[PDB]
Amino acid sequence: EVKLVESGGGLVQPGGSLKLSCAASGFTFSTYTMSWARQTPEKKLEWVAYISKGGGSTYYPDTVKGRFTISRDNAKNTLYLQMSSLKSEDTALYYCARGAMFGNDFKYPMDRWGQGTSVTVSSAATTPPSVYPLAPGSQTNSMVTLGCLVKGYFPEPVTVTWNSGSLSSGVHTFPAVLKSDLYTLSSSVTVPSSVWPSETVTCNVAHPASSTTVDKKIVPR
Protein backbone atom coordinates (compact mmCIF):
# COMPACT_ATOMS: atom_id res chain seq x y z
CA GLU A 1 0.00 0.00 0.00
CA VAL A 2 0.94 3.68 -0.19
CA LYS A 3 3.36 4.54 2.61
CA LEU A 4 5.05 7.82 3.52
CA VAL A 5 7.63 8.00 6.31
CA GLU A 6 8.84 11.32 7.69
CA SER A 7 12.12 11.85 9.52
CA GLY A 8 14.35 14.71 10.57
CA GLY A 9 12.33 16.31 13.34
CA GLY A 10 13.99 17.72 16.43
CA LEU A 11 14.45 20.64 18.82
CA VAL A 12 15.72 23.85 17.18
CA GLN A 13 16.41 27.30 18.59
CA PRO A 14 14.28 30.22 17.32
CA GLY A 15 15.81 31.55 14.11
CA GLY A 16 17.39 28.19 13.38
CA SER A 17 17.05 25.75 10.48
CA LEU A 18 16.01 22.12 10.06
CA LYS A 19 15.53 19.84 7.05
CA LEU A 20 12.79 17.19 7.05
CA SER A 21 12.71 14.15 4.73
CA CYS A 22 9.89 11.92 3.57
CA ALA A 23 10.56 8.49 2.02
CA ALA A 24 7.73 7.30 -0.22
CA SER A 25 6.66 3.83 -1.37
CA GLY A 26 3.69 1.92 -2.75
CA PHE A 27 3.05 4.16 -5.76
CA THR A 28 4.86 5.75 -8.69
CA PHE A 29 6.33 8.78 -6.88
CA SER A 30 7.36 10.66 -10.01
CA THR A 31 3.81 10.90 -11.37
CA TYR A 32 2.39 12.48 -8.23
CA THR A 33 2.35 15.97 -6.75
CA MET A 34 3.21 16.00 -3.02
CA SER A 35 2.59 18.23 0.02
CA TRP A 36 3.52 18.91 3.63
CA ALA A 37 1.01 19.76 6.39
CA ARG A 38 1.33 20.07 10.15
CA GLN A 39 -0.64 19.76 13.36
CA THR A 40 0.04 22.42 15.94
CA PRO A 41 0.34 21.83 19.70
CA GLU A 42 -3.24 23.18 19.87
CA LYS A 43 -4.23 20.34 17.49
CA LYS A 44 -5.06 22.65 14.58
CA LEU A 45 -4.35 21.28 11.08
CA GLU A 46 -2.47 23.51 8.63
CA TRP A 47 -1.31 23.13 5.03
CA VAL A 48 2.44 23.88 4.77
CA ALA A 49 3.61 23.33 1.16
CA TYR A 50 2.83 21.85 -2.27
CA ILE A 51 5.11 20.70 -5.09
CA SER A 52 4.60 19.61 -8.71
CA LYS A 53 5.45 16.10 -9.93
CA GLY A 54 8.78 17.25 -11.38
CA GLY A 55 9.57 19.92 -8.80
CA GLY A 56 9.16 22.77 -11.27
CA SER A 57 6.41 24.53 -9.32
CA THR A 58 5.96 25.13 -5.60
CA TYR A 59 3.23 26.76 -3.51
CA TYR A 60 3.09 27.96 0.10
CA PRO A 61 0.78 29.78 2.49
CA ASP A 62 1.93 33.28 3.54
CA THR A 63 2.80 31.98 7.01
CA VAL A 64 5.88 30.13 5.74
CA LYS A 65 6.53 31.57 2.31
CA GLY A 66 10.09 32.78 2.01
CA ARG A 67 11.26 30.69 4.99
CA PHE A 68 10.36 27.11 3.97
CA THR A 69 11.33 25.33 0.76
CA ILE A 70 9.68 22.12 -0.38
CA SER A 71 11.77 20.04 -2.79
CA ARG A 72 11.99 16.49 -4.09
CA ASP A 73 14.53 14.03 -5.43
CA ASN A 74 12.55 11.60 -7.59
CA ALA A 75 15.63 9.39 -7.98
CA LYS A 76 15.52 8.82 -4.20
CA ASN A 77 11.72 8.67 -4.01
CA THR A 78 12.06 11.31 -1.30
CA LEU A 79 10.34 14.63 -0.52
CA TYR A 80 12.00 17.36 1.60
CA LEU A 81 11.05 20.41 3.63
CA GLN A 82 13.92 22.77 4.34
CA MET A 83 12.92 25.09 7.18
CA SER A 84 14.82 28.29 8.08
CA SER A 85 14.35 31.36 10.33
CA LEU A 86 12.20 29.13 12.50
CA LYS A 87 9.60 30.71 14.80
CA SER A 88 7.69 29.43 17.82
CA GLU A 89 4.63 29.37 15.54
CA ASP A 90 6.35 26.62 13.56
CA THR A 91 6.32 24.13 16.46
CA ALA A 92 4.24 21.17 15.24
CA LEU A 93 4.03 17.56 14.11
CA TYR A 94 4.86 17.71 10.39
CA TYR A 95 3.19 15.34 7.94
CA CYS A 96 4.14 14.28 4.42
CA ALA A 97 1.12 13.71 2.15
CA ARG A 98 0.55 12.47 -1.37
CA GLY A 99 -1.11 15.12 -3.60
CA ALA A 100 -3.17 17.11 -4.04
CA MET A 101 -4.18 15.97 -7.52
CA PHE A 102 -6.56 17.03 -10.30
CA GLY A 103 -7.91 13.91 -12.01
CA ASN A 104 -10.71 11.66 -13.25
CA ASP A 105 -12.95 14.74 -13.19
CA PHE A 106 -12.31 14.52 -9.45
CA LYS A 107 -10.24 16.70 -7.12
CA TYR A 108 -8.19 14.50 -4.82
CA PRO A 109 -6.95 16.29 -1.70
CA MET A 110 -3.77 15.39 0.19
CA ASP A 111 -3.96 11.73 1.17
CA ARG A 112 -2.05 8.83 2.74
CA TRP A 113 -0.52 11.20 5.31
CA GLY A 114 2.52 9.79 7.07
CA GLN A 115 2.53 9.49 10.87
CA GLY A 116 4.77 12.56 11.05
CA THR A 117 7.95 13.95 12.54
CA SER A 118 7.90 16.38 15.47
CA VAL A 119 9.54 19.80 15.47
CA THR A 120 9.84 22.08 18.49
CA VAL A 121 11.20 25.63 18.20
CA SER A 122 12.41 26.74 21.61
CA SER A 123 15.36 28.40 23.32
CA ALA A 124 15.25 25.79 26.09
CA ALA A 125 17.79 22.97 26.07
CA THR A 126 16.75 19.35 25.84
CA THR A 127 16.19 17.50 29.11
CA PRO A 128 16.11 13.69 29.23
CA PRO A 129 13.31 11.90 31.08
CA SER A 130 13.77 9.94 34.28
CA VAL A 131 11.89 6.68 33.80
CA TYR A 132 10.44 5.07 36.88
CA PRO A 133 8.71 1.72 37.33
CA LEU A 134 5.24 1.62 38.90
CA ALA A 135 4.65 -1.58 40.87
CA PRO A 136 1.83 -2.31 43.37
CA GLY A 137 2.58 -1.18 46.91
CA SER A 138 0.88 -4.12 48.64
CA GLN A 139 -2.31 -10.19 45.61
CA THR A 140 -5.94 -9.17 45.43
CA ASN A 141 -6.87 -9.34 41.75
CA SER A 142 -6.85 -11.75 38.79
CA MET A 143 -5.56 -8.88 36.61
CA VAL A 144 -2.63 -6.74 37.73
CA THR A 145 -2.01 -3.21 36.45
CA LEU A 146 1.57 -1.97 36.22
CA GLY A 147 2.87 1.37 35.07
CA CYS A 148 5.75 3.46 33.83
CA LEU A 149 6.33 7.11 34.84
CA VAL A 150 8.30 9.18 32.30
CA LYS A 151 9.21 12.31 34.23
CA GLY A 152 10.66 15.75 33.54
CA TYR A 153 11.66 15.78 29.90
CA PHE A 154 11.81 18.37 27.14
CA PRO A 155 10.65 18.58 24.52
CA GLU A 156 7.90 16.23 23.39
CA PRO A 157 7.67 13.53 22.27
CA VAL A 158 8.67 10.20 23.78
CA THR A 159 7.74 6.70 22.69
CA VAL A 160 6.60 4.03 25.15
CA THR A 161 6.19 0.31 24.52
CA TRP A 162 5.90 -2.78 26.70
CA ASN A 163 8.19 -5.82 26.34
CA SER A 164 9.83 -4.39 23.20
CA GLY A 165 6.38 -4.06 21.74
CA SER A 166 5.46 -7.72 22.15
CA LEU A 167 2.95 -6.64 24.81
CA SER A 168 0.39 -4.38 23.13
CA SER A 169 -2.94 -5.46 24.62
CA GLY A 170 -4.36 -3.78 27.74
CA VAL A 171 -2.26 -0.63 27.45
CA HIS A 172 -3.10 3.02 28.16
CA THR A 173 -0.44 5.63 27.40
CA PHE A 174 -1.53 9.02 28.69
CA PRO A 175 -0.95 12.49 27.20
CA ALA A 176 1.99 14.41 28.67
CA VAL A 177 1.31 17.36 30.98
CA LEU A 178 3.53 20.41 31.43
CA LYS A 179 4.75 21.50 34.89
CA SER A 180 7.57 23.96 35.58
CA ASP A 181 8.64 23.86 31.92
CA LEU A 182 9.02 20.07 31.79
CA TYR A 183 6.65 17.34 30.57
CA THR A 184 5.55 14.30 32.54
CA LEU A 185 3.80 11.28 31.07
CA SER A 186 2.70 7.81 32.22
CA SER A 187 1.58 4.49 30.75
CA SER A 188 -0.28 1.59 32.35
CA VAL A 189 -0.55 -2.03 31.26
CA THR A 190 -2.89 -4.62 32.71
CA VAL A 191 -1.92 -8.29 32.57
CA PRO A 192 -3.09 -11.59 34.11
CA SER A 193 -1.85 -11.99 37.67
CA SER A 194 -0.41 -15.37 36.65
CA VAL A 195 1.97 -13.65 34.23
CA TRP A 196 3.54 -11.06 36.58
CA PRO A 197 5.80 -11.24 38.54
CA SER A 198 6.25 -14.90 37.61
CA GLU A 199 7.32 -13.54 34.20
CA THR A 200 9.02 -10.35 32.96
CA VAL A 201 7.33 -7.01 32.14
CA THR A 202 9.45 -4.13 30.87
CA CYS A 203 8.67 -0.53 29.86
CA ASN A 204 10.70 0.68 26.85
CA VAL A 205 11.02 4.45 26.68
CA ALA A 206 12.72 6.55 24.02
CA HIS A 207 13.29 10.31 23.91
CA PRO A 208 15.03 10.96 20.55
CA ALA A 209 15.84 14.60 21.27
CA SER A 210 18.07 13.62 24.19
CA SER A 211 19.41 10.39 22.69
CA THR A 212 17.67 8.61 25.54
CA THR A 213 16.55 5.00 25.61
CA VAL A 214 15.46 3.21 28.77
CA ASP A 215 14.23 -0.35 29.21
CA LYS A 216 12.80 -0.31 32.71
CA LYS A 217 11.94 -3.67 34.25
CA ILE A 218 8.92 -3.64 36.53
CA VAL A 219 9.75 -5.69 39.59
CA PRO A 220 7.66 -6.43 42.67
CA ARG A 221 8.31 -4.36 45.79
Partner: protein, 208 residues
Protein backbone atom coordinates in the same frame (compact mmCIF):
# COMPACT_ATOMS: atom_id res chain seq x y z
CA UNK B 1 -7.53 32.45 4.03
CA UNK B 2 -11.01 30.90 3.92
CA UNK B 3 -12.36 30.21 7.39
CA UNK B 4 -14.06 26.86 7.84
CA UNK B 5 -16.34 26.72 10.88
CA UNK B 6 -17.34 23.42 12.46
CA UNK B 7 -19.95 23.78 15.21
CA UNK B 8 -20.62 22.26 17.68
CA UNK B 9 -16.98 21.44 18.47
CA UNK B 10 -18.17 18.34 20.30
CA UNK B 11 -21.19 16.22 19.42
CA UNK B 12 -22.56 13.15 21.17
CA UNK B 13 -24.10 10.15 19.40
CA UNK B 14 -25.88 6.97 20.37
CA UNK B 15 -24.89 3.62 18.87
CA UNK B 16 -26.84 2.92 15.69
CA UNK B 17 -28.24 6.41 15.17
CA UNK B 18 -27.47 8.86 12.37
CA UNK B 19 -25.65 12.13 12.98
CA UNK B 20 -24.62 15.00 10.71
CA UNK B 21 -21.56 17.22 11.15
CA UNK B 22 -21.49 20.62 9.46
CA UNK B 23 -18.90 22.97 8.00
CA UNK B 24 -19.66 26.55 6.96
CA UNK B 25 -17.24 28.66 4.90
CA UNK B 26 -16.45 32.38 4.97
CA UNK B 27 -16.22 32.22 1.16
CA UNK B 28 -18.01 30.18 -1.52
CA UNK B 29 -15.97 27.06 -2.42
CA UNK B 30 -16.44 24.55 -5.23
CA UNK B 31 -15.87 21.40 -3.17
CA UNK B 32 -15.26 20.28 0.41
CA UNK B 33 -13.26 17.27 1.67
CA UNK B 34 -13.33 15.47 5.02
CA UNK B 35 -10.74 13.76 7.23
CA UNK B 36 -11.06 11.56 10.29
CA UNK B 37 -8.42 11.55 13.01
CA UNK B 38 -8.40 8.73 15.54
CA UNK B 39 -6.22 8.56 18.66
CA UNK B 40 -2.49 8.44 17.94
CA UNK B 41 -2.70 8.47 14.15
CA UNK B 42 -2.56 11.05 11.37
CA UNK B 43 -5.72 12.32 9.62
CA UNK B 44 -7.27 9.84 7.19
CA UNK B 45 -9.30 10.92 4.14
CA UNK B 46 -12.99 9.98 4.37
CA UNK B 47 -14.74 12.02 1.69
CA UNK B 48 -13.35 13.80 -1.35
CA UNK B 49 -14.95 16.20 -3.85
CA UNK B 50 -17.88 16.76 -1.47
CA UNK B 51 -19.60 13.38 -1.72
CA UNK B 52 -17.16 10.70 -2.86
CA UNK B 53 -16.11 7.94 -0.45
CA UNK B 54 -12.38 7.32 -0.24
CA UNK B 55 -10.98 3.80 -0.67
CA UNK B 56 -11.82 1.55 2.28
CA UNK B 57 -14.29 3.89 3.94
CA UNK B 58 -17.57 2.31 5.10
CA UNK B 59 -20.71 3.23 3.16
CA UNK B 60 -22.33 4.51 6.35
CA UNK B 61 -20.38 7.72 5.62
CA UNK B 62 -21.74 10.26 3.14
CA UNK B 63 -21.34 13.94 2.31
CA UNK B 64 -23.21 16.76 0.60
CA UNK B 65 -22.90 20.49 0.19
CA UNK B 66 -22.57 23.54 -2.00
CA UNK B 67 -21.57 27.19 -1.78
CA UNK B 68 -20.63 27.89 1.83
CA UNK B 69 -22.47 25.04 3.54
CA UNK B 70 -21.30 21.42 3.60
CA UNK B 71 -21.90 18.37 5.77
CA UNK B 72 -20.82 14.83 6.65
CA UNK B 73 -23.40 12.23 7.71
CA UNK B 74 -22.85 8.95 9.53
CA UNK B 75 -25.92 6.76 8.86
CA UNK B 76 -25.58 4.57 11.97
CA UNK B 77 -22.90 5.32 14.53
CA UNK B 78 -20.45 2.60 15.59
CA UNK B 79 -18.02 2.62 18.53
CA UNK B 80 -15.13 2.93 16.08
CA UNK B 81 -16.43 6.32 14.97
CA UNK B 82 -15.14 8.01 18.15
CA UNK B 83 -12.77 10.53 16.56
CA UNK B 84 -12.17 14.08 15.38
CA UNK B 85 -13.61 15.03 11.97
CA UNK B 86 -12.15 17.90 9.93
CA UNK B 87 -13.41 19.62 6.79
CA UNK B 88 -10.90 20.93 4.26
CA UNK B 89 -10.85 22.96 1.06
CA UNK B 90 -8.11 23.28 -1.53
CA UNK B 91 -10.17 25.14 -4.14
CA UNK B 92 -8.37 28.36 -3.16
CA UNK B 93 -4.90 29.23 -1.81
CA UNK B 94 -4.11 28.96 0.97
CA UNK B 95 -5.68 25.54 1.46
CA UNK B 96 -7.51 25.54 4.80
CA UNK B 97 -9.08 23.30 7.48
CA UNK B 98 -11.99 23.52 9.88
CA UNK B 99 -11.32 23.48 13.63
CA UNK B 100 -12.75 20.00 13.86
CA UNK B 101 -15.72 18.36 15.58
CA UNK B 102 -15.12 15.54 18.06
CA UNK B 103 -17.72 12.77 17.98
CA UNK B 104 -18.33 11.21 21.40
CA UNK B 105 -20.10 7.86 21.72
CA UNK B 106 -22.69 7.35 24.46
CA UNK B 107 -22.60 4.23 26.65
CA UNK B 108 -23.52 3.03 30.14
CA UNK B 109 -21.85 4.64 33.14
CA UNK B 110 -18.92 2.54 34.32
CA UNK B 111 -16.84 2.86 37.47
CA UNK B 112 -13.09 3.09 36.94
CA UNK B 113 -10.62 0.37 37.82
CA UNK B 114 -8.33 2.25 40.18
CA UNK B 115 -4.69 1.43 40.87
CA UNK B 116 -2.43 3.41 43.18
CA UNK B 117 1.37 3.35 43.16
CA UNK B 118 3.89 4.61 45.74
CA UNK B 119 7.09 6.40 44.65
CA UNK B 120 9.64 3.95 43.24
CA UNK B 121 12.77 3.45 45.35
CA UNK B 122 14.63 4.76 42.31
CA UNK B 123 12.82 8.08 42.29
CA UNK B 124 13.30 8.51 46.02
CA UNK B 125 17.05 8.17 45.57
CA UNK B 126 16.92 11.12 43.16
CA UNK B 127 15.24 13.25 45.82
CA UNK B 128 11.78 13.24 44.30
CA UNK B 129 8.54 11.47 45.13
CA UNK B 130 5.64 11.01 42.75
CA UNK B 131 2.54 9.07 43.68
CA UNK B 132 0.53 7.77 40.74
CA UNK B 133 -3.09 6.69 40.33
CA UNK B 134 -4.69 5.26 37.20
CA UNK B 135 -8.49 5.47 36.73
CA UNK B 136 -9.03 3.10 33.84
CA UNK B 137 -12.00 2.30 31.62
CA UNK B 138 -14.75 4.51 33.02
CA UNK B 139 -17.70 6.56 31.73
CA UNK B 140 -18.71 9.36 31.47
CA UNK B 141 -15.55 11.39 30.72
CA UNK B 142 -16.28 13.78 33.55
CA UNK B 143 -14.85 12.20 36.68
CA UNK B 144 -13.25 13.66 39.77
CA UNK B 145 -10.04 12.45 41.36
CA UNK B 146 -9.16 13.38 44.92
CA UNK B 147 -5.85 12.89 46.73
CA UNK B 148 -5.68 12.59 50.49
CA UNK B 149 -2.49 12.53 52.57
CA UNK B 150 -2.97 11.35 56.16
CA UNK B 151 -6.72 11.76 55.74
CA UNK B 152 -6.61 15.32 54.41
CA UNK B 153 -7.15 16.43 50.82
CA UNK B 154 -4.10 17.58 48.87
CA UNK B 155 -4.84 19.82 45.91
CA UNK B 156 -1.54 21.28 44.72
CA UNK B 157 1.05 19.41 42.66
CA UNK B 158 -1.51 17.20 40.90
CA UNK B 159 -1.25 16.53 37.14
CA UNK B 160 -4.25 14.88 35.42
CA UNK B 161 -4.36 13.52 31.87
CA UNK B 162 -7.26 11.80 30.02
CA UNK B 163 -6.94 9.43 27.07
CA UNK B 164 -9.13 9.85 23.99
CA UNK B 165 -12.36 7.81 24.02
CA UNK B 166 -11.71 4.09 23.39
CA UNK B 167 -12.69 2.81 19.92
CA UNK B 168 -13.87 -0.53 21.28
CA UNK B 169 -15.65 -0.03 24.61
CA UNK B 170 -16.23 3.73 24.43
CA UNK B 171 -14.67 4.31 27.87
CA UNK B 172 -12.02 6.80 29.00
CA UNK B 173 -8.98 6.39 31.24
CA UNK B 174 -7.07 9.03 33.19
CA UNK B 175 -3.74 9.24 35.02
CA UNK B 176 -3.35 11.40 38.13
CA UNK B 177 0.15 12.16 39.40
CA UNK B 178 0.72 13.75 42.81
CA UNK B 179 4.21 15.32 42.90
CA UNK B 180 5.91 15.78 46.29
CA UNK B 181 9.49 16.21 47.47
CA UNK B 182 11.14 13.17 49.10
CA UNK B 183 11.17 14.81 52.54
CA UNK B 184 7.53 15.79 52.17
CA UNK B 185 6.63 12.20 51.30
CA UNK B 186 8.63 10.79 54.22
CA UNK B 187 6.78 13.15 56.58
CA UNK B 188 3.45 11.35 56.07
CA UNK B 189 2.21 7.75 55.94
CA UNK B 190 -1.29 7.42 54.46
CA UNK B 191 -1.78 8.11 50.72
CA UNK B 192 -5.16 7.80 49.03
CA UNK B 193 -6.78 8.58 45.70
CA UNK B 194 -10.54 8.65 45.37
CA UNK B 195 -12.50 8.49 42.10
CA UNK B 196 -15.97 10.08 42.25
CA UNK B 197 -18.71 11.30 39.92
CA UNK B 198 -22.28 10.97 41.23
CA UNK B 199 -20.16 5.61 45.65
CA UNK B 200 -16.48 6.32 44.87
CA UNK B 201 -13.68 3.88 44.14
CA UNK B 202 -10.88 4.34 46.66
CA UNK B 203 -7.34 2.93 46.80
CA UNK B 204 -4.63 3.66 49.34
CA UNK B 205 -1.35 2.59 50.91
CA UNK B 206 0.79 3.35 53.97
CA UNK B 207 4.39 4.38 53.28
CA UNK B 208 5.40 2.24 56.27
Amino acid sequence: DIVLTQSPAIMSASLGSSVTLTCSASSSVSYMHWYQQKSGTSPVLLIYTTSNLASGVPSRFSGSGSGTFYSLTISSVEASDAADYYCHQWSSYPWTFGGGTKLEIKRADAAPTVSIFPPSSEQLTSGGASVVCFLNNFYPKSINSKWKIDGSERQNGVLNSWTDQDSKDSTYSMSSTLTLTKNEYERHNSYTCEATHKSPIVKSFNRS
